[PDB]
Amino acid sequence: KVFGRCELAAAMKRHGLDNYRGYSLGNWVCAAKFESNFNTQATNRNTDGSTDYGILQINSRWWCNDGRTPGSRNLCNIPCSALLSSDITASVNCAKKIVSDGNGMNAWVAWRNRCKGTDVQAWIRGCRL
Ligand SMILES: CNC(=O)/C=C(\C)OP(=O)(O)OC
Question: What is the CATH number of the domain that holds 84?
Fold first, then answer.
């Protein structure tokens, strides 16, 4: 699924991500924008052989099991495929563990480089939430 901007905002709000660990909904939307362009089925191989999965590009080196990432962990206790669902529940739950790990949303490199410090509120401008 390719979410609309406000559609995704509403889904993230519905699943308790707005102001989770103090990150406003804008931040989650901006991150998903530059991670997946809103597309739940987004996958990208990393040069180290891990893969990033879904709207928030959760990585198999630590978070989810894909069975092909030697040495990795699965700290969200999910197959990475479950991060590709139309329903964002699994991604949202794992993103909550990721963002609580200590470095906040800086774990998402695209958030650091493209969202951090910006007028992230634009991402939810005009949305009925
Ligand atoms: C295209 N994939 C990515 O940008 C992966 C990002 C850095 O990983 P998170 O989303 O940082 O992974 C837990």
Answer: 1.10.530.10
Q: For residues 80 and 67, what is the distance between their CA atoms, to the nearest angstrom?
A: 9
If phi > 0 it is left, if psi is from -120 to 50 it is alpha, else beta; for residue 16 that is left
Report how far residue 5's alpha carbon sits from residue 65's, in angstroms, rounded to the nearest whole number: 29
Residue whose pair of structure tokens reads 């990721």 in the numeric block: 98
Question: What domain range is 77 assigned to?
Answer: 1-129
Distance 58 CA to ligand 1 centre (A): 6
Which residues contact residue 79 at a Cβ distance below 8 angstroms, ignoring those fewer than 6 apart? 64, 65, 66
Instruction: Count up the domains in the chain and report the number.
Output: 1
Task: Give the C-alpha separation, 114 to 103, whole Å.
Answer: 16
Known binding residue 66? Answer is no
Q: Name the residues annotated as catalytic.
A: 35, 52
Instruction: Give residue 55 CA to ligand 1 midpoint distance, Å.
Output: 10
CA distances from 87 to 11, 124, 128 (A): 9, 20, 20
Single-letter code of the amino acid located at 80? C
- CA gap 35, 37 in Å, rounded: 6
